[PDB]
Symmetry: C2
Subunit: 183 residues, 2 copies
Amino acid sequence: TNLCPFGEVFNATKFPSVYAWERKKISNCVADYSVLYNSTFFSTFKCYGVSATKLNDLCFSNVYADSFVVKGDDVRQIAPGQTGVIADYNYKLPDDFMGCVLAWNTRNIDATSTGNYNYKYRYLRHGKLRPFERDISNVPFSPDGKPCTPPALNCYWPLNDYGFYTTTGIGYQPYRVVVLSFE
Amino acid sequence: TNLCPFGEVFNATKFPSVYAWERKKISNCVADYSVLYNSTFFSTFKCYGVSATKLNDLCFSNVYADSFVVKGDDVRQIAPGQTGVIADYNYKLPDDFMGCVLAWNTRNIDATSTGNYNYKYRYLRHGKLRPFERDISNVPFSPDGKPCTPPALNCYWPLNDYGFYTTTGIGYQPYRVVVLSFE
């Protein structure tokens, strides 16, 4: 009884911004993938920290699922040991990560001809994130560390919008991402 | 009844050369990964053609398993859409591949300080292989296509040995590869 709430993960109408990534717990449930929508085709499906003795982990029966959107060229940062703005300041996996990263192109729902700017990422921060840390503040940033009031000079806004347009290359298109941690 | 022949696949003492890659069918059985070896940790675990409604394919219940050895720098050729000597002349995945590619570093058992030369690959051929095609011939090769009898000019032997040494970078180290097709 109780089927896994994978629909809430893969088929959610809205996905979070990566700076505001969301986690859902999946445990103590039966998996029925037949009640998900068809046509969710993973262009990335990469698993880390898996051993032959623990191949049963790919049944996904006890899992945390983290969801967010990035641009295509940033999907490579959702891996252990990566650097760049997403890994450093938004969503960080541990080096010893045990889990899988799934991504799929969502140009058709997440991009517009006029530009969808609803998804954001943090580009400035005082410190990189530890693994599975999350920062949701939107506080003026000063390089020197001092508190800071716009329009003061050397005072910056730490988030930047992705701009998702319908007529750009794949590296600039939106990807929904789900990271499953074996647990 | 019947526990999966995964031991035969993952735990074999000798692996095939990639030109002479081997296939094993795994179906009508229940998995017991416990008897497999601890210490087999996959440095590559990448799945292709998966969709959300087919996530259960990752239980690996009905599956062909292809095994062989390549060097580290060649593992990237074991993916859909790749070119190079291995993809072209040894082992070809189709563009529409539905399955997972697993690899792990085996310097410890497949490389020697003196050089292990038991693993081979084809480096000369007239034409690229079709997906899942296997060529185990070893007849002399002429670039003009004509029949060939060594020791004549423009006559060559089409297979080369990998040389696996203990004291080399990871790109030159041996990797055991298991490709699991959801077929």
